[PDB]
Design a protein around this ligand. Sequence first.
Ligand SMILES: CC(=O)NC[C@H]1CN(c2ccc(N3CCOCC3)c(F)c2)C(=O)O1
Ligand SMILES: [Cl-]
Ligand SMILES: [Cl-]
Ligand SMILES: [Cl-]
Ligand SMILES: [Cl-]
Ligand SMILES: [Cl-]
Ligand SMILES: [K+]
Ligand SMILES: [Mg+2]
Ligand SMILES: [Mg+2]
Ligand SMILES: [Mg+2]
Ligand SMILES: [Mg+2]
Ligand SMILES: [Mg+2]
Ligand SMILES: [Mg+2]
Ligand SMILES: [Mg+2]
Ligand code: NA
Ligand code: NA
Ligand code: NA
Ligand code: NA
Ligand code: NA
Ligand code: NA
Ligand code: NA
Ligand code: NA
Ligand code: NA
Ligand SMILES: [Sr+2]
Ligand SMILES: [Sr+2]
Ligand SMILES: [Sr+2]
Ligand SMILES: [Sr+2]
Ligand SMILES: [Sr+2]
Ligand SMILES: [Sr+2]
Ligand SMILES: [Sr+2]
Ligand SMILES: [Sr+2]
Ligand SMILES: [Sr+2]
Ligand SMILES: [Sr+2]
Ligand SMILES: [Sr+2]
Ligand SMILES: [Sr+2]
Lengths: 142, 29, 172, 160
Amino acid sequence: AEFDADVIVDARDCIMGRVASQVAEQALDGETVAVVNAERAVITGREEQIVEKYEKRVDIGNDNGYFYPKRPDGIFKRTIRGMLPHKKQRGREAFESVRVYLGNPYDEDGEVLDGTSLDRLSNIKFVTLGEISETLGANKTW
Amino acid sequence: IPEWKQEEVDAIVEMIESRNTLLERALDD
Amino acid sequence: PRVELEIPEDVDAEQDHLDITVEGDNGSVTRRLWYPDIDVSVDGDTVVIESDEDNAKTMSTIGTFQSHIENMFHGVTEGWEYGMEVFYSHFPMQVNVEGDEVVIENFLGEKAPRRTTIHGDTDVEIDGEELTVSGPDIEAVGQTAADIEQLTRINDKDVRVFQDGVYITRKP
Amino acid sequence: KPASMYRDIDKPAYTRREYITGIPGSKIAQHKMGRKQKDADDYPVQISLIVEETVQLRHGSLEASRLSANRHLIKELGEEGDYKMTLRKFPHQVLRENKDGMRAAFGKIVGTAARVQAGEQLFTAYCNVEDAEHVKEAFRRAYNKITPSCRIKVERGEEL
RNA sequence: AGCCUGUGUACCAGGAGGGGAACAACCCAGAGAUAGGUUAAGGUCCCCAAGUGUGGAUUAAGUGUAAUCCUCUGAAGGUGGUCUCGAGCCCUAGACAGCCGGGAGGUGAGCUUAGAAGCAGCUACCCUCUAAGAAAAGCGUAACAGCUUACCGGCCGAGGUU
RNA sequence: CGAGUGGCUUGCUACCUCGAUGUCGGUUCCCUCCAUCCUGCCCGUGCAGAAGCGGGCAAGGGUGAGGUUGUUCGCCUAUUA
Ligand SMILES: CC(=O)NC[C@H]1CN(c2ccc(N3CCOCC3)c(F)c2)C(=O)O1
Ligand SMILES: [Cl-]
Ligand SMILES: [Cl-]
Ligand SMILES: [Cl-]
Ligand SMILES: [Cl-]
Ligand SMILES: [Cl-]
Ligand SMILES: [K+]
Ligand SMILES: [Mg+2]
Ligand SMILES: [Mg+2]
Ligand SMILES: [Mg+2]
Ligand SMILES: [Mg+2]
Ligand SMILES: [Mg+2]
Ligand SMILES: [Mg+2]
Ligand SMILES: [Mg+2]
Ligand code: NA
Ligand code: NA
Ligand code: NA
Ligand code: NA
Ligand code: NA
Ligand code: NA
Ligand code: NA
Ligand code: NA
Ligand code: NA
Ligand SMILES: [Sr+2]
Ligand SMILES: [Sr+2]
Ligand SMILES: [Sr+2]
Ligand SMILES: [Sr+2]
Ligand SMILES: [Sr+2]
Ligand SMILES: [Sr+2]
Ligand SMILES: [Sr+2]
Ligand SMILES: [Sr+2]
Ligand SMILES: [Sr+2]
Ligand SMILES: [Sr+2]
Ligand SMILES: [Sr+2]
Ligand SMILES: [Sr+2]
């Protein structure tokens, strides 16, 4: 609810890993970032092996716990956390000044970061975060 | 340059004197 | 590579994005033709399938897109029809169309009716021991027919002896 | 015993019969097959099975490959077919096995093997242009019973 | 065998510092203090200093992103997955494939055999018509029939095949 | 005959521990692996059917009671999917 984002990024049709790497770099530079339309971000590869990896992460765990997100919401934010020293002061500060959303709760339309776009016309082997979440069992609230 | 085709175009022209391409060939003579 | 398909006078083909729609006197069919770097478009009187790549994998899909489109042309005009025959040795098999699915009763004596839902706007007309599956979408028709035959599949017993079931008699 | 035990050339050459006793006999029945009264020059085709890696081949394997090859040639060209095949290597290297821990470990003699350098011809056949494929099949069965990969090479033969 | 036992050498032992996730001996490097600068090994999407660098190609398996290694596996065998290069032969006098038509008579050859007629076995394997057609390459029959390969013609139209 | 994987058996080594890392079998209680015995779904058959034999996917659940023997193992009995 209300997030003074210095930058609003549109993840739609964008390679998640590539977006995350830039959002991290900017959060560490002090920018407050809001990633939009997470459910529509994409990750290249063979949907079958991709899903096996994310399902394995869901099955891993124990008493100590390995809480892994299932919604495109968290999947994306965890992806970003892995690019930040979130256990350090400076790192946790950057991370906490970053938020991912389902759809776009803002009025403006996020911008599209350079090099992160995927041309659907030249690509068939890729998957949507939303699709992954649905497979993982998430409740399609988007 | 198949020889049997050449010999045919002749044999055909011979009977014309006294495959379709080969017949059209002989007619062209 | 580039191939050009002159569309039949009986037909009209429109396409926006990755979806192509073909309409004729027999109906209409819409398909999605999506493959890396293969552009499908309607250039007035002809449909065009082209790409800058010529690798085996691309050439394969191009030829596939072609037959899919020509099949759509054929489907909207002449249409597609598969002919099937119901055959039984001891128990009279009862094949009927009920709703949007064909129901088969008393297969090999079974008390529970075997059934399958019809795909698309496929028409399954039955007359005696003969069935005729037809429609404009060859994909839908083809499956419906196949589905009907698969509906009497048996794995438990020797098929050479128990040959009851409906079979595709004529492929279009 | 697995060939992994002796397929590599990781030991000195051990072939001196004058200092080695109890060497088991060879299981290789013949080194010259087919019509051994006829010359090799009397044939239009000459095909050799070439080893692609340096290795040691125990006589047990030479016999199995040779046998499984000549056997095919016999089944396809007859007990007297117009062909001739040669196994050109002989198992000179003596093999041991330490069969008491590592004390006085020098092994007792257990067998023999032939050292084959990569690129060499283990077998070589000579046939008529007709049976050229029957020999290629014989070798295919032969390199399936010896450690290394092999190239089936047609030396004298251009009816191709 | 991260085994045992030699030999030469450099290293650890007794060797910091930089790199290698961590890690006696692998790489750079031999080091007084303090300070500025430039490199070495190694690295430049983020974590993490420096490229989401350039020209070009391949890979679709997340192969791979693993110098060395007890530590990083992957083999014999197989692959019309895909890319690249070479050779031979066939082809607009129409190839390869497909589809359509023809696949004929003497004659169901002779022999054996009740029987045998392309096709149980044995021998031979000839000539007519013709633009083709075996004394029949594979099924099939009790034996016939029937179904096709060879072989010819048409339709088609561009590379094909080894 | 050839090529491998595992690390349950055994052997080998002597790297760790001799200012102490308590044995075998059993029991009780928890998690796991798949090279699957049953159960689910399949393929082949020397598949008529029934019952089998062989193979594929698959580790969700199940795999029990008893006689000798400390036994592990195994032999034996009646049940059992
Ligand atoms: C109590 C003790 O000695 N603690 C010190 C060490 C040695 N050890 C041990 C060694 C041999 C044996 N055995 C087992 C049976 O075969 C004879 C030797 C053993 F039980 C136990 C162990 O666990 O820790
Ligand atoms: Cl957990
Ligand atoms: Cl951290
Ligand atoms: Cl793709
Ligand atoms: Cl020094
Ligand atoms: Cl991955
Ligand atoms: K001890
Ligand atoms: Mg010391
Ligand atoms: Mg940086
Ligand atoms: Mg890997
Ligand atoms: Mg010790
Ligand atoms: Mg399994
Ligand atoms: Mg059965
Ligand atoms: Mg379980
Ligand atoms: Na990826
Ligand atoms: Na988890
Ligand atoms: Na001793
Ligand atoms: Na030193
Ligand atoms: Na370090
Ligand atoms: Na990987
Ligand atoms: Na192993
Ligand atoms: Na199970
Ligand atoms: Na017992
Ligand atoms: Sr950056
Ligand atoms: Sr050695
Ligand atoms: Sr081999
Ligand atoms: Sr780049
Ligand atoms: Sr490039
Ligand atoms: Sr280790
Ligand atoms: Sr290695
Ligand atoms: Sr291999
Ligand atoms: Sr498995
Ligand atoms: Sr079962
Ligand atoms: Sr035990
Ligand atoms: Sr016992």
